Scaffold this active site. Structure first.
Site, mmCIF file in Angstrom:
data_model
loop_
_atom_site.group_PDB
_atom_site.id
_atom_site.type_symbol
_atom_site.label_atom_id
_atom_site.label_comp_id
_atom_site.label_asym_id
_atom_site.label_seq_id
_atom_site.Cartn_x
_atom_site.Cartn_y
_atom_site.Cartn_z
ATOM 1 N N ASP A 242 -6.114 13.622 -5.745
ATOM 2 C CA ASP A 242 -5.291 13.169 -6.866
ATOM 3 C C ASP A 242 -5.833 11.872 -7.438
ATOM 4 O O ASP A 242 -5.073 10.964 -7.811
ATOM 5 C CB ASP A 242 -3.812 13.038 -6.468
ATOM 6 C CG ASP A 242 -2.857 13.054 -7.652
ATOM 7 O OD1 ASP A 242 -3.278 13.337 -8.792
ATOM 8 O OD2 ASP A 242 -1.685 12.782 -7.376
ATOM 9 N N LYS B 30 7.574 6.104 -8.613
ATOM 10 C CA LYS B 30 7.544 7.323 -7.810
ATOM 11 C C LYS B 30 6.081 7.686 -7.593
ATOM 12 O O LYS B 30 5.370 8.012 -8.553
ATOM 13 C CB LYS B 30 8.302 8.463 -8.510
ATOM 14 N N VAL C 7 8.965 4.393 -4.447
ATOM 15 C CA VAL C 7 8.418 3.156 -3.892
ATOM 16 C C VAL C 7 9.216 1.980 -4.406
ATOM 17 O O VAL C 7 9.452 1.866 -5.613
ATOM 18 C CB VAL C 7 6.935 2.970 -4.229
ATOM 19 C CG1 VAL C 7 6.434 1.671 -3.579
ATOM 20 C CG2 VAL C 7 6.101 4.137 -3.742
ATOM 21 N N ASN D 53 3.491 10.405 -5.625
ATOM 22 C CA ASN D 53 3.506 11.818 -5.245
ATOM 23 C C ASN D 53 4.411 12.044 -4.038
ATOM 24 O O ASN D 53 4.219 11.418 -2.989
ATOM 25 C CB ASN D 53 2.079 12.314 -4.975
#
Ligand SMILES: CCS(=O)(=O)N1CCN(c2ccc(Nc3ncc(C(N)=O)c(NC4CC4)n3)cc2)CC1
Length: 300
Positions: A144, A25, A31, A27
């Site tokens: 991030d 996962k 996937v 953000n």
């Protein structure tokens, strides 16, 4: 209106995009690994496919922005955009990207210490700085940066991923004030991001300092940024009190410790990134040059 934005809806057709594996996962999303096999011969390129977990209107708009950001980037140390798949009969959207076999740098450091030494850590550091130099030329703020969001192609190549929080600087300003925040990775945030919601190249430099810390802790149990900050703040603290104490600690020079075995010179780079004075933080160009000089100054 008259003519819709250019798209290539036949580049990755859903009927030819074959599931191989669930990966994780990133953000806002999930996937998967897939193989794109248009010659229905059980061959084809292996790709990563990002999908939403909750396909709301707002999330789809944010996803379109992430796709446009990634498509605009081409750099050896940035995960490669490949295309979009308009699945569900062209009523859904998925992002097609390259697949990197070793996963996140956070996981690789934990799973593959047998093949990691300081030389490799400095190579990864350099690569990350160069990717970030490139983002800055586009006036993109990643927001991030963390080892969880850097991906590993092989023992000598890492790439920045997860552009789900990335923002484009306004034309006239050197910072982006985020007026919608979601869940925030507070233990990677610069103090002005915590107190004013202001993000900039310099706050990405702050977070890069945390990444450099992460690398040299070798993702050791109890040494992660959240674990160490919570130890400093008080492990029993919950809720907003955590944020209040993190802010106060940072504003008065509290910092993550030098990791075990970390050279003083590398810790100095970290501490220079963690400057409360935004303008005094080094640039990514400064950092790439310094790290490469350190690497090159070794014997051999
Ligand atoms: C051994 C511990 S494990 O068993 O738990 N384990 C570790 C390996 N692993 C894995 C995860 C991602 C990738 N490759 C990849 N490539 C590209 C992207 C991209 N373009 O975003 C991406 N994104 C995803 C990061 C969200 N992920 C390869 C392996 C999951 C299972």
């Amino acid at each position: 209106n008259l003519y819709f934005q250019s798209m290539d809806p036949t580049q990755f057709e859903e009927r030819h995009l074959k599931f191989l594996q669930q990966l994780g996962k990133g953000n806002f999303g999930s996937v998967e690994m897939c193989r794109y096999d248009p010659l229905q011969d059980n061959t084809g390129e292996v790709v990563a496919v990002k999908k939403l977990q909750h396909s709301t209107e707002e999330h789809l708009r944010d996803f379109e922005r992430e796709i446009e950001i990634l498509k605009s980037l081409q750099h050896d140390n940035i995960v490669k955009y490949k295309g979009v798949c308009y699945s569900a009969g062209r009523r859904n959207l998925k992002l097609i990207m390259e697949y990197l076999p070793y996963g996140s740098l956070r996981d690789y450091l934990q799973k593959h210490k047998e093949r990691i030494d300081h030389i490799k850590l400095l190579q990864y550091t350099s690569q990350i700085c160069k990717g970030m130099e490139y983002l800055g030329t586009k006036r993109y703020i990643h927001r991030d940066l963390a080892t969880r969001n850097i991906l590993v192609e092989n023992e000598n190549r890492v790439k920045i991923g997860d552009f789900g929080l990335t923002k484009v600087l306004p034309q006239d300003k050197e910072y982006y004030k985020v007026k919608e925040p979601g869940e925030s990775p507070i233990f990677w945030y610069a103090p002005e991001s915590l107190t004013e919601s202001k993000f900039s190249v310099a706050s990405d430099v702050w977070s890069f300092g945390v990444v450099l810390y992460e690398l040299f802790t070798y993702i050791e149990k109890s040494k992660s940024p959240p674990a160490e900050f919570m130890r400093m703040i008080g492990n029993d603290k919950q809720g907003q009190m955590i944020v209040f104490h993190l802010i106060e600690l940072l504003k008065n020079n509290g910092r993550l410790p030098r990791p075990d075995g970390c050279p003083d010179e590398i810790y100095m780079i970290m501490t220079e990134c963690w400057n409360n004075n935004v303008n005094q933080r080094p640039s990514f160009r400064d950092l790439a040059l310094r790290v490469d000089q350190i690497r090159d100054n070794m014997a051999g």
